[PDB]
Amino acid sequence: CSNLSTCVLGKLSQELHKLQTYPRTDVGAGTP
Ligand SMILES: *[C@@H]1O[C@H](CO)[C@@H](O[C@@H]2O[C@H](CO)[C@@H](O[C@@H]3O[C@H](CO[C@H]4O[C@H](CO[C@H]5O[C@H](CO)[C@@H](O)[C@H](O)[C@@H]5O)[C@@H](O)[C@H](O[C@H]5O[C@H](CO)[C@@H](O)[C@H](O)[C@@H]5O)[C@@H]4O)[C@@H](O)[C@H](O[C@H]4O[C@H](CO)[C@@H](O)[C@H](O)[C@@H]4O[C@H]4O[C@H](CO)[C@@H](O)[C@H](O)[C@@H]4O)[C@@H]3O)[C@H](O)[C@H]2NC(C)=O)[C@H](O)[C@H]1NC(C)=O
Numbered sequence: 598c599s600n601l602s603t604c605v606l607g608k609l610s611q612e613l614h615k616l617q618t619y620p621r622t623d624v625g626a627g628t629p
Pocket of ligand 1: 600601602603604
């Protein structure tokens with residue numbers, strides 16, 4: 598990711614989707 602802006606918000610949004618939908622079933626959280 599050249600962005601680290603559009604991309605980082607995308608990854609944070611994806612992380613939030615996963616942990617909300619399911620408690621814990623391989624949450625992404627690739628957000629250093
Ligand atoms: C996360 O990552 C993603 C990755 O995708 C990022 O998305 C991408 O982001 C970039 C950068 O913003 C985008 O680039 C864009 O590039 C165009 C290039 O020009 C196009 O539009 C022209 C419009 O007309 C202008 O030019 C004519 C001719 O000189 C003038 O008469 C007009 O008045 C305008 O100035 C067009 O002319 C170009 O060519 C076409 O038309 C001509 C003329 O008819 C033909 O000859 C050609 O053949 C052809 O048909 C071309 O289509 C920029 O225009 C975009 O916006 C910049 O320029 C605008 C106009 O000046 C200005 O209003 C904007 O503010 C902006 O200006 C900034 O950037 C300029 C370019 O570097 C600088 O010169 C300027 O100083 C200023 O810094 C835009 O830059 C990508 O499209 C976009 N998507 C993809 C898929 O790549 C995303 O942004 C990232 N997000 C974050 C948060 O990090």
